[PDB]
Design a protein around this ligand. Structure first.
Ligand SMILES: *[C@@H]1O[C@H](CO)[C@@H](O)[C@H](O)[C@H]1NC(C)=O
Lengths: 49, 50, 50
């Protein structure tokens, strides 16, 4: 689970925060990425930790 | 939920496939066919057309 | 029709704080790349807001 600002970082040949320090994809990747919104499942009015 | 549209949660599932590496273990839905020889046909061996 | 232009100069530009400032989706560029903006540098920056 990530935020909307870093969905484009889940790609080959990209740097940043998620793509470089948490989850790095190889340059010769052969696969498919599926991302969808989860505001009704993983959100709380008090904040999520 | 009050936050902006660029800061919403997003569930990500990433599927990675390995191919042309080993004898095949997982394969998609396609029925088999009996084998003939000594005649040129349109073969299909685990997704290799020809 | 009266868009505001701000001249950004004589400072150190960090582009990693733009995502925290505004909840947008895509940092769409045309001449450069979003991930390479902290390495190289320019003469002047102009920000046009509307
Ligand atoms: C925007 O500026 C206002 C006024 O200082 C401040 O209250 C608010 O927290 C700022 N928002 C962001 C995202 O910086």
């Amino acid at each position: 689970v990530i935020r909307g600002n870093e969905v484009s970082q889940i790609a080959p040949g990209q740097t940043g925060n998620i793509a470089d320090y948490n989850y790095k994809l190889p340059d010769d990747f052969t696969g498919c990425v599926i991302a969808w919104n989860s505001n009704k499942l993983d959100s709380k009015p008090s904040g999520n930790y | 939920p009050t936050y902006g549209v660029g800061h919403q949660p997003y569930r990500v599932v990433v599927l990675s496939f390995e191919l042309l590496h080993a004898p095949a273990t997982v394969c998609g839905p396609k029925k088999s066919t009996n084998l003939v020889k000594n005649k040129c046909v349109n073969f299909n061996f685990n997704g290799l057309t020809g | 029709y009266a868009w505001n232009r701000k001249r950004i100069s004589n400072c150190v530009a960090d582009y990693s704080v733009i995502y925290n400032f505004a909840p947008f989706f895509a940092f769409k560029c045309y001449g450069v790349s979003p991930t390479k903006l902290n390495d190289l540098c320019f003469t002047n920056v102009y920000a046009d807001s509307f």
